[PDB]
Short mmCIF file of C-alpha atoms and ligand atoms in Angstrom, two decimals:
data_model
loop_
_atom_site.label_atom_id
_atom_site.label_comp_id
_atom_site.label_asym_id
_atom_site.label_seq_id
_atom_site.Cartn_x
_atom_site.Cartn_y
_atom_site.Cartn_z
CA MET A 1 112.75 -59.51 37.66
CA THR A 2 108.98 -59.94 37.19
CA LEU A 3 106.17 -57.48 36.32
CA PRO A 4 105.22 -55.86 39.70
CA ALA A 5 101.62 -55.25 38.84
CA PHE A 6 100.88 -58.99 39.10
CA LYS A 7 99.89 -59.58 42.85
CA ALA A 8 98.76 -62.51 44.73
CA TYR A 9 95.06 -62.20 43.92
CA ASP A 10 94.72 -59.37 41.21
CA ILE A 11 96.56 -57.04 39.05
CA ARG A 12 97.32 -53.52 40.21
CA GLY A 13 99.85 -50.92 39.50
CA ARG A 14 100.57 -47.33 38.51
CA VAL A 15 99.57 -46.30 35.18
CA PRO A 16 101.26 -46.09 32.75
CA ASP A 17 104.72 -47.57 33.85
CA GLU A 18 103.34 -50.81 35.67
CA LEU A 19 100.01 -51.06 33.90
CA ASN A 20 99.06 -49.61 30.31
CA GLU A 21 96.95 -50.52 27.29
CA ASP A 22 99.75 -52.63 25.78
CA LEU A 23 99.90 -54.84 28.89
CA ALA A 24 96.13 -54.90 29.14
CA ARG A 25 95.98 -56.18 25.57
CA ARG A 26 98.57 -58.85 26.23
CA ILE A 27 96.59 -59.91 29.28
CA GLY A 28 93.55 -60.37 27.19
CA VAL A 29 95.34 -62.64 24.87
CA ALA A 30 96.99 -64.54 27.74
CA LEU A 31 93.58 -64.98 29.62
CA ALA A 32 91.89 -66.48 26.38
CA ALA A 33 94.59 -69.27 26.64
CA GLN A 34 93.63 -70.01 30.27
CA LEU A 35 89.96 -70.29 30.08
CA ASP A 36 87.60 -72.90 29.05
CA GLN A 37 85.37 -72.33 26.01
CA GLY A 38 82.89 -69.40 26.07
CA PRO A 39 82.60 -65.59 26.02
CA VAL A 40 84.29 -63.14 28.66
CA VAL A 41 82.48 -60.39 30.69
CA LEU A 42 84.18 -57.21 30.91
CA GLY A 43 83.36 -54.38 33.24
CA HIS A 44 84.98 -51.37 34.76
CA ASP A 45 85.02 -48.77 37.52
CA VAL A 46 85.00 -45.02 37.45
CA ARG A 47 88.79 -44.39 37.26
CA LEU A 48 89.67 -42.20 34.40
CA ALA A 49 91.91 -44.87 32.64
CA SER A 50 89.53 -47.62 33.24
CA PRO A 51 87.47 -47.65 29.77
CA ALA A 52 90.82 -47.56 27.72
CA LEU A 53 92.22 -50.46 29.65
CA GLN A 54 88.84 -52.34 29.18
CA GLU A 55 89.05 -51.75 25.42
CA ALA A 56 92.57 -52.90 25.17
CA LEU A 57 91.53 -56.03 27.12
CA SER A 58 88.73 -56.67 24.83
CA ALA A 59 90.95 -56.12 21.74
CA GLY A 60 93.28 -58.88 22.92
CA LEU A 61 90.54 -61.33 23.82
CA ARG A 62 88.75 -60.85 20.34
CA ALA A 63 92.12 -61.05 18.69
CA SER A 64 92.17 -64.65 20.29
CA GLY A 65 88.73 -65.50 19.28
CA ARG A 66 86.85 -64.83 22.30
CA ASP A 67 83.40 -63.03 22.25
CA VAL A 68 83.33 -60.22 24.67
CA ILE A 69 80.27 -59.11 26.78
CA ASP A 70 80.74 -55.48 27.78
CA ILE A 71 78.58 -54.89 30.81
CA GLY A 72 80.07 -51.24 31.12
CA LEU A 73 80.53 -49.04 34.11
CA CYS A 74 79.87 -51.31 37.11
CA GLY A 75 80.83 -52.77 40.49
CA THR A 76 83.19 -55.59 40.82
CA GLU A 77 80.34 -57.75 42.21
CA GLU A 78 78.49 -57.17 38.91
CA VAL A 79 81.29 -58.86 36.90
CA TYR A 80 81.06 -61.72 39.21
CA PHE A 81 77.34 -61.94 39.04
CA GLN A 82 77.20 -61.61 35.11
CA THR A 83 80.12 -64.01 34.49
CA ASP A 84 78.12 -66.70 36.38
CA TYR A 85 74.63 -65.68 35.34
CA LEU A 86 75.56 -65.45 31.70
CA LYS A 87 77.57 -68.84 31.87
CA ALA A 88 80.59 -67.07 30.72
CA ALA A 89 84.13 -68.58 30.44
CA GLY A 90 85.36 -65.85 32.70
CA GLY A 91 85.27 -62.10 33.45
CA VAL A 92 87.60 -59.15 34.14
CA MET A 93 86.91 -56.05 36.31
CA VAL A 94 88.96 -53.19 35.51
CA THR A 95 89.36 -51.41 38.80
CA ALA A 96 91.90 -50.18 41.49
CA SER A 97 89.22 -50.40 44.19
CA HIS A 98 90.48 -47.90 46.73
CA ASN A 99 94.03 -46.99 45.63
CA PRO A 100 95.36 -43.62 44.34
CA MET A 101 94.13 -41.93 41.27
CA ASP A 102 97.45 -42.72 39.22
CA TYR A 103 96.69 -46.51 39.89
CA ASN A 104 94.46 -49.09 38.17
CA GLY A 105 94.13 -52.76 37.94
CA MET A 106 92.07 -55.96 37.05
CA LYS A 107 90.33 -58.76 38.89
CA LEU A 108 90.22 -61.86 36.94
CA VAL A 109 87.70 -64.84 37.29
CA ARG A 110 86.95 -68.01 35.34
CA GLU A 111 83.79 -70.09 35.15
CA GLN A 112 81.12 -69.46 37.89
CA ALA A 113 83.20 -66.26 38.87
CA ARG A 114 85.82 -68.72 40.33
CA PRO A 115 88.99 -66.52 41.30
CA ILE A 116 92.09 -66.58 39.17
CA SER A 117 94.95 -66.00 41.66
CA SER A 118 98.67 -66.29 41.46
CA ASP A 119 98.80 -70.07 41.90
CA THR A 120 95.68 -70.61 39.90
CA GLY A 121 96.33 -68.98 36.61
CA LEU A 122 97.33 -65.57 37.38
CA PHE A 123 101.11 -66.09 37.31
CA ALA A 124 100.82 -68.10 34.43
CA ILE A 125 99.09 -65.21 32.57
CA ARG A 126 101.95 -62.82 33.99
CA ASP A 127 104.71 -65.05 32.51
CA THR A 128 102.87 -65.41 29.21
CA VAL A 129 102.30 -61.51 29.02
CA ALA A 130 106.01 -61.09 29.96
CA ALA A 131 107.21 -63.18 27.24
CA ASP A 132 104.85 -62.05 24.54
CA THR A 133 106.48 -60.00 21.73
CA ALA A 134 104.12 -61.10 18.98
CA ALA A 135 102.41 -58.75 16.79
CA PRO A 136 98.85 -57.72 17.86
CA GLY A 137 96.47 -59.92 15.86
CA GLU A 138 93.28 -58.52 14.47
CA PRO A 139 89.80 -59.34 16.01
CA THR A 140 88.23 -62.66 14.98
CA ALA A 141 85.30 -62.30 17.38
CA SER A 142 82.63 -59.62 18.36
CA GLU A 143 81.88 -57.50 21.37
CA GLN A 144 78.41 -57.23 22.63
CA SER A 145 77.08 -54.35 24.85
CA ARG A 146 75.08 -55.83 27.56
CA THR A 147 74.48 -53.02 30.26
CA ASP A 148 71.06 -54.34 31.53
CA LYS A 149 71.23 -54.69 35.25
CA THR A 150 67.72 -56.15 35.62
CA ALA A 151 68.71 -59.70 36.56
CA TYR A 152 71.41 -58.29 38.95
CA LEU A 153 68.82 -55.85 40.71
CA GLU A 154 66.25 -58.76 40.87
CA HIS A 155 68.86 -60.91 42.46
CA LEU A 156 69.70 -58.28 45.02
CA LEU A 157 66.21 -57.73 45.98
CA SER A 158 65.58 -61.40 46.30
CA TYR A 159 67.46 -61.30 49.71
CA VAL A 160 64.65 -59.41 51.56
CA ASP A 161 60.87 -59.68 51.92
CA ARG A 162 60.00 -56.15 50.69
CA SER A 163 56.64 -56.23 52.62
CA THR A 164 58.43 -56.27 55.84
CA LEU A 165 60.67 -53.32 55.26
CA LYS A 166 60.07 -50.07 57.05
CA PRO A 167 60.85 -46.60 55.50
CA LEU A 168 64.25 -46.26 57.37
CA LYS A 169 66.22 -43.13 56.68
CA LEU A 170 69.60 -44.39 55.31
CA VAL A 171 72.68 -42.30 54.71
CA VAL A 172 74.54 -43.65 51.60
CA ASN A 173 77.99 -42.53 50.82
CA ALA A 174 79.51 -43.87 47.39
CA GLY A 175 82.65 -41.67 47.86
CA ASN A 176 82.22 -40.82 44.30
CA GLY A 177 82.71 -44.38 43.31
CA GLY A 178 80.21 -46.37 41.66
CA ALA A 179 77.73 -47.61 44.44
CA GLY A 180 75.19 -44.57 44.00
CA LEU A 181 74.23 -45.76 40.51
CA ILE A 182 73.02 -49.09 42.01
CA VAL A 183 71.37 -47.38 45.04
CA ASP A 184 69.44 -45.17 42.60
CA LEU A 185 68.16 -48.19 40.69
CA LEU A 186 67.25 -50.06 43.77
CA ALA A 187 65.49 -47.07 45.39
CA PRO A 188 62.12 -47.29 43.33
CA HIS A 189 61.67 -50.82 44.65
CA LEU A 190 62.35 -49.93 48.37
CA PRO A 191 60.72 -47.75 50.92
CA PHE A 192 63.66 -46.18 52.41
CA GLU A 193 64.49 -42.47 52.38
CA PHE A 194 68.22 -41.96 51.15
CA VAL A 195 70.43 -39.15 52.14
CA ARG A 196 73.00 -39.28 49.55
CA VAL A 197 76.61 -38.24 50.30
CA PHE A 198 79.46 -37.92 47.72
CA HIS A 199 77.12 -39.60 45.33
CA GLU A 200 77.97 -38.75 41.88
CA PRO A 201 80.60 -40.82 40.15
CA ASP A 202 83.91 -38.88 39.62
CA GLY A 203 87.13 -40.68 38.87
CA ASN A 204 88.85 -37.36 39.94
CA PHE A 205 87.60 -38.01 43.42
CA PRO A 206 87.22 -34.54 44.58
CA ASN A 207 86.17 -35.52 48.12
CA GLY A 208 89.18 -38.10 48.55
CA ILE A 209 89.85 -41.54 47.13
CA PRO A 210 87.08 -43.92 48.15
CA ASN A 211 88.26 -45.52 51.31
CA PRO A 212 85.82 -45.39 54.19
CA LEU A 213 88.39 -46.29 56.68
CA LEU A 214 90.28 -43.17 56.38
CA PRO A 215 88.83 -41.09 59.48
CA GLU A 216 88.43 -38.10 57.41
CA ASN A 217 86.06 -39.98 54.95
CA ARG A 218 84.57 -41.87 57.90
CA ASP A 219 83.53 -38.49 59.28
CA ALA A 220 81.47 -37.44 56.28
CA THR A 221 79.28 -40.55 56.79
CA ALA A 222 79.01 -40.10 60.45
CA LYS A 223 78.00 -36.31 60.28
CA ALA A 224 75.49 -37.04 57.70
CA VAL A 225 73.83 -39.71 59.98
CA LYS A 226 73.76 -37.44 62.98
CA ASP A 227 72.76 -34.18 61.22
CA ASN A 228 69.84 -36.00 59.54
CA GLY A 229 68.72 -38.41 62.31
CA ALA A 230 69.43 -41.32 60.04
CA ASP A 231 68.58 -44.89 61.18
CA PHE A 232 72.20 -45.87 59.98
CA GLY A 233 74.76 -44.97 57.35
CA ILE A 234 76.33 -47.09 54.68
CA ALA A 235 79.64 -46.28 52.91
CA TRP A 236 81.39 -48.30 50.08
CA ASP A 237 84.82 -48.53 48.51
CA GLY A 238 85.13 -47.42 44.96
CA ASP A 239 84.26 -50.60 43.28
CA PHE A 240 81.67 -51.18 46.15
CA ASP A 241 82.59 -54.86 46.94
CA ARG A 242 83.18 -53.49 50.50
CA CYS A 243 80.53 -51.74 52.56
CA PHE A 244 80.87 -50.07 55.91
CA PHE A 245 78.31 -49.29 58.45
CA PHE A 246 77.61 -46.42 60.80
CA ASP A 247 74.92 -46.65 63.55
CA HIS A 248 72.43 -43.86 64.37
CA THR A 249 74.87 -42.28 66.74
CA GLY A 250 77.48 -41.99 63.89
CA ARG A 251 79.62 -44.66 65.44
CA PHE A 252 81.57 -46.82 62.76
CA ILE A 253 80.68 -50.39 63.44
CA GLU A 254 83.89 -52.68 63.44
CA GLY A 255 83.43 -55.28 60.68
CA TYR A 256 83.88 -58.13 62.98
CA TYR A 257 80.60 -57.71 64.47
CA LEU A 258 78.87 -57.66 61.08
CA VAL A 259 79.91 -61.21 60.42
CA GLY A 260 77.78 -62.62 63.34
CA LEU A 261 74.93 -60.23 62.55
CA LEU A 262 74.71 -61.13 58.87
CA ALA A 263 75.02 -64.97 59.66
CA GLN A 264 72.13 -64.82 62.00
CA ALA A 265 70.30 -62.85 59.19
CA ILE A 266 71.04 -65.37 56.52
CA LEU A 267 70.48 -68.48 58.88
CA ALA A 268 66.84 -67.28 59.67
CA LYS A 269 66.27 -67.88 55.92
CA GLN A 270 68.48 -70.86 55.31
CA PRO A 271 68.36 -72.77 58.80
CA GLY A 272 71.06 -75.22 59.68
CA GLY A 273 73.46 -73.71 57.05
CA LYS A 274 77.21 -73.69 57.31
CA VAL A 275 78.92 -70.28 57.72
CA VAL A 276 82.59 -69.61 56.74
CA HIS A 277 84.55 -67.28 58.83
CA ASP A 278 88.31 -66.24 58.97
CA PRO A 279 90.56 -66.74 62.04
CA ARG A 280 91.57 -63.21 62.99
CA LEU A 281 88.64 -62.72 65.29
CA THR A 282 86.42 -65.64 66.09
CA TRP A 283 84.63 -65.90 69.34
CA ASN A 284 81.71 -63.77 68.62
CA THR A 285 80.93 -65.27 65.22
CA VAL A 286 81.20 -68.85 66.50
CA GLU A 287 78.68 -68.24 69.30
CA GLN A 288 76.34 -66.21 67.10
CA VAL A 289 76.27 -68.79 64.30
CA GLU A 290 75.70 -71.56 66.72
CA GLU A 291 72.96 -69.81 68.68
CA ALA A 292 71.10 -69.32 65.35
CA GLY A 293 71.46 -73.04 64.64
CA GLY A 294 74.37 -72.72 62.00
CA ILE A 295 77.60 -74.54 61.77
CA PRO A 296 80.74 -72.37 61.92
CA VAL A 297 83.54 -73.29 59.62
CA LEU A 298 87.07 -71.80 60.35
CA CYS A 299 88.85 -70.87 57.11
CA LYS A 300 92.21 -68.81 56.28
CA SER A 301 91.35 -65.35 55.42
CA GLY A 302 91.55 -64.04 51.87
CA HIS A 303 88.63 -64.30 49.33
CA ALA A 304 90.26 -67.33 47.35
CA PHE A 305 90.42 -69.40 50.54
CA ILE A 306 86.77 -68.39 51.65
CA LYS A 307 85.14 -68.99 48.34
CA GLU A 308 86.76 -72.41 47.93
CA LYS A 309 85.85 -73.44 51.51
CA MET A 310 82.23 -72.27 51.14
CA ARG A 311 82.02 -74.28 47.90
CA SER A 312 83.39 -77.50 49.43
CA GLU A 313 80.91 -77.05 52.50
CA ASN A 314 78.05 -75.88 50.62
CA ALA A 315 78.20 -72.94 53.05
CA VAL A 316 75.40 -70.46 52.75
CA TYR A 317 77.36 -67.48 53.84
CA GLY A 318 80.89 -66.38 54.57
CA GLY A 319 82.22 -63.27 56.22
CA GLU A 320 85.61 -61.71 56.89
CA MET A 321 86.22 -59.00 59.60
CA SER A 322 87.65 -56.85 56.85
CA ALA A 323 84.27 -55.89 55.12
CA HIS A 324 84.11 -58.85 52.89
CA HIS A 325 80.63 -60.89 52.69
CA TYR A 326 80.18 -63.83 50.48
CA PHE A 327 76.84 -65.44 49.51
CA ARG A 328 76.32 -68.89 48.03
CA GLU A 329 73.43 -67.83 45.99
CA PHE A 330 75.59 -64.98 44.56
CA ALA A 331 77.99 -67.31 42.77
CA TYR A 332 79.78 -67.68 46.10
CA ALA A 333 80.91 -64.15 45.54
CA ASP A 334 81.27 -61.08 47.71
CA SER A 335 78.71 -58.17 47.41
CA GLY A 336 78.56 -54.79 48.97
CA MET A 337 75.04 -54.55 48.26
CA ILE A 338 73.44 -57.67 49.80
CA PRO A 339 74.89 -56.94 53.34
CA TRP A 340 73.04 -53.54 53.76
CA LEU A 341 69.78 -54.88 52.43
CA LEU A 342 69.97 -57.65 54.97
CA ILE A 343 70.69 -55.19 57.81
CA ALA A 344 68.03 -52.96 56.69
CA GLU A 345 65.67 -55.79 56.82
CA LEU A 346 66.68 -56.85 60.27
CA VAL A 347 66.46 -53.27 61.57
CA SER A 348 62.93 -53.19 60.17
CA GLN A 349 61.77 -56.67 61.22
CA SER A 350 63.12 -56.52 64.75
CA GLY A 351 62.53 -52.94 65.78
CA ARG A 352 65.98 -52.72 67.12
CA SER A 353 68.49 -50.11 66.10
CA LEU A 354 71.61 -51.23 64.44
CA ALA A 355 73.46 -49.90 67.61
CA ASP A 356 71.53 -52.14 69.99
CA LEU A 357 71.82 -55.11 67.59
CA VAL A 358 75.69 -55.03 68.02
CA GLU A 359 76.02 -53.39 71.41
CA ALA A 360 75.82 -56.50 73.60
CA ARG A 361 78.14 -58.44 71.29
CA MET A 362 80.86 -55.62 71.38
CA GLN A 363 80.69 -55.79 75.14
CA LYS A 364 80.76 -59.41 75.23
CA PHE A 365 83.82 -59.87 72.83
CA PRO A 366 85.60 -56.46 72.76
CA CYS A 367 88.48 -56.41 70.15
CA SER A 368 91.42 -54.32 69.32
CA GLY A 369 90.48 -53.86 65.62
CA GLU A 370 93.26 -54.79 63.06
CA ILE A 371 96.55 -53.06 64.12
CA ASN A 372 99.29 -52.96 61.44
CA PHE A 373 103.12 -53.09 62.34
CA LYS A 374 105.88 -52.19 59.82
CA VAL A 375 108.84 -53.96 61.48
CA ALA A 376 112.61 -54.55 60.63
CA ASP A 377 112.21 -58.21 60.77
CA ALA A 378 108.64 -59.86 61.00
CA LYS A 379 110.00 -63.33 61.83
CA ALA A 380 111.98 -62.18 64.70
CA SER A 381 109.28 -59.91 65.97
CA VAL A 382 106.75 -62.87 65.91
CA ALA A 383 109.22 -65.01 67.81
CA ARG A 384 109.70 -62.26 70.55
CA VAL A 385 105.98 -62.39 71.15
CA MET A 386 105.69 -66.19 71.18
CA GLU A 387 108.57 -66.48 73.51
CA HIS A 388 107.09 -64.00 75.84
CA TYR A 389 103.90 -65.92 76.18
CA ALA A 390 105.36 -69.41 76.13
CA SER A 391 105.02 -69.88 79.97
CA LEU A 392 101.28 -69.36 79.79
CA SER A 393 100.98 -72.33 77.44
CA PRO A 394 98.29 -70.92 74.90
CA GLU A 395 96.40 -73.06 72.67
CA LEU A 396 98.13 -72.60 69.22
CA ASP A 397 96.47 -72.78 65.78
CA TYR A 398 98.40 -72.09 62.60
CA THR A 399 95.31 -71.88 60.05
CA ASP A 400 96.42 -68.27 59.07
CA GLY A 401 99.66 -67.07 60.88
CA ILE A 402 99.63 -67.70 64.50
CA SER A 403 96.33 -67.83 66.61
CA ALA A 404 97.08 -68.12 70.44
CA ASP A 405 94.09 -68.92 72.93
CA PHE A 406 94.84 -68.02 76.38
CA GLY A 407 91.32 -68.74 77.76
CA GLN A 408 89.83 -65.26 78.51
CA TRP A 409 91.87 -63.63 75.68
CA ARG A 410 93.25 -64.44 72.33
CA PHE A 411 95.30 -62.91 69.59
CA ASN A 412 95.92 -63.63 65.85
CA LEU A 413 99.22 -62.52 64.12
CA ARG A 414 99.59 -62.67 60.41
CA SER A 415 102.51 -61.62 58.14
CA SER A 416 102.19 -59.53 54.90
CA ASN A 417 103.79 -61.77 52.23
CA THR A 418 105.03 -58.85 50.20
CA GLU A 419 106.18 -55.98 52.82
CA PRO A 420 107.51 -56.58 56.31
CA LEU A 421 104.01 -55.88 57.72
CA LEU A 422 102.56 -57.67 60.54
CA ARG A 423 98.78 -57.57 61.44
CA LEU A 424 97.43 -57.93 64.87
CA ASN A 425 94.09 -58.80 66.13
CA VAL A 426 93.13 -59.31 69.94
CA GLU A 427 89.91 -60.06 71.63
CA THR A 428 88.82 -60.89 75.12
CA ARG A 429 85.84 -62.41 76.94
CA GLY A 430 84.04 -59.28 78.07
CA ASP A 431 87.15 -57.72 79.50
CA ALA A 432 88.24 -54.22 78.20
CA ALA A 433 91.06 -53.78 80.54
CA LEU A 434 92.67 -57.08 79.64
CA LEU A 435 92.06 -56.15 75.97
CA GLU A 436 94.11 -52.79 76.38
CA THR A 437 96.90 -54.31 78.53
CA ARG A 438 97.51 -57.23 76.26
CA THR A 439 97.26 -55.34 73.02
CA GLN A 440 99.76 -52.74 74.41
CA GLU A 441 102.05 -55.57 75.75
CA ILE A 442 102.05 -57.28 72.24
CA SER A 443 102.60 -53.94 70.60
CA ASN A 444 105.75 -53.33 72.57
CA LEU A 445 107.08 -56.69 71.89
CA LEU A 446 106.40 -56.37 68.12
CA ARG A 447 108.23 -52.90 68.21
CA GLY A 448 111.06 -54.17 69.99
MG1 LIG B 501 86.89 -52.99 46.47
#
């Protein structure tokens, strides 16, 4: 067998049986063998085990002659930004993002914060670590502490015209992850009044693990927006590379609609640019990008595909319906901070509420949201769906699972490559009744 903690795109596992300090040190040794010349940036999140795992990673890297740049407690996007900004050979973020408290992990990048994934170095590292019975060497390189966030903060602020910002009232919900530290460092430079919910970093997570998709966690942000009359609310996952929006009514905004909104925001700054989007939900993004003078570029979902497509296209922005937003000028990386700064600027400049900015789009292209199905046989379940609809002759696309376009409605059906888990997304052309009957029909077929 193989080490279960090595996944398709990162390392994650239960501490200490799936991930521990010895494994972390061996990963540092293995990573040093995979990178071009240069130092390695290390950062970590608020989880209790994260500092010790980072220190073991540093020990392995320095045993292999790599200088380490320790940027300390941070978000995942800061490892991306500093790896690129400091022209490092690579970087590692120690984080489990949104997983349970006994879990941790790592996200690995090389030069320019390019992802290291299972087929681009991560499984080479796994097998090296798995075979490594060598004695731990001693450090032949130094660690430098570099916690200065000035360049990162200046970069974030460069996305908005601060003289155009209004003193909006914004709920911010770090979920006791790390986002509140960055909010507080941005605040002196912004006119907003912040309503801070679950703000203090606490790896014990007394208010729940940081996952704004859980309805109970969703409701703390919604309640703060409604009780304070806030313009909108923002919540983050624990390492805040994902953000989530709540309009002034407390309504959680489905991430699909943020792709089109942010693309229009960016295209006003970078006219004629290309915008990369995923295949799960498409019609609204294609229309909004084209109306703003941009060029939409379809791409398989998952950050490694999006980033490499953005690079090959010189795309200014990429967005996934699942709360991932990527920016060319940000090393083609994802940020949970840039998106809400852009949205706050859009609300400020337009005089429109976030609710009204998305309302007509939600009416024009209603969607199901992503619906997950644990099935006995994913391949047979997909076959049942496709056989049922064969007589309607949908237009089929295989960019990412199966996309089927029927004219006034479409769906995307994708398989989990690890667990027998299908993911369904449906959308229609302004027809909520059709959305529900087709969603339920597909659901019945999948469960059959
Ligand atoms: Mg995350």
